[PDB]
């Protein structure tokens, strides 16, 4: 399980499995529906 904060709208998200630069497709924010940009989101990711 990976937690992260959407760089667009700032809401906390939770996704199954790892979230690395190699994960494809990226997880989508539950609130604004924008696919998470890895470089913008990476500092917030915890696993």
């Amino acid at each position: 399980v990976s937690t992260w904060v959407c760089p667009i709208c700032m809401v906390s998200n939770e996704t199954q499995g790892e979230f690395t630069k190699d994960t494809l497709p990226t997880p989508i924010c539950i609130n604004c529906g924008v696919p998470a940009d890895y470089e913008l989101t990476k500092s917030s990711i915890n696993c």
Binding site: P7, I8, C9, N31, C32, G33, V34, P35, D37, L40
Partner: protein, 94 residues
């Protein structure tokens, strides 16, 4: 500022405006355009500027629509004004 990111954000602002002037009004047409705009803006700078929050509000609102809802003719006019103002303010930051 990273010049490539500035060019990409500027292109994205004009592309969403051109879409609105071509009568794009559905969730499935506008959401991806606004998504790519907001991503490109954050690549340039994470700093606040006029109407940045409003454009966030719009993409959240558009995300909650059902599949085949459209924005009203006057909703479209509002969003256009808000985009034009954000574009002016983003350019002033440069």
């Amino acid at each position: 500022f990273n010049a490539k990111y500035v060019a990409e954000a500027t292109g994205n602002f004009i592309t969403v405006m051109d879409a609105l002037k071509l009568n794009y009004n559905a969730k499935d047409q506008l959401h991806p355009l606004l998504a790519e705009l907001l991503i490109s803006i954050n690549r340039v700078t994470r700093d606040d500027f006029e109407n940045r929050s409003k454009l966030i509000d719009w993409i959240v609102r558009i995300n909650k629509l059902s599949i085949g809802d459209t924005l009203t003719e006057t909703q479209i006019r509002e969003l256009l004004f808000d985009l034009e103002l954000a574009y002016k303010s983003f350019y002033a930051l440069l």
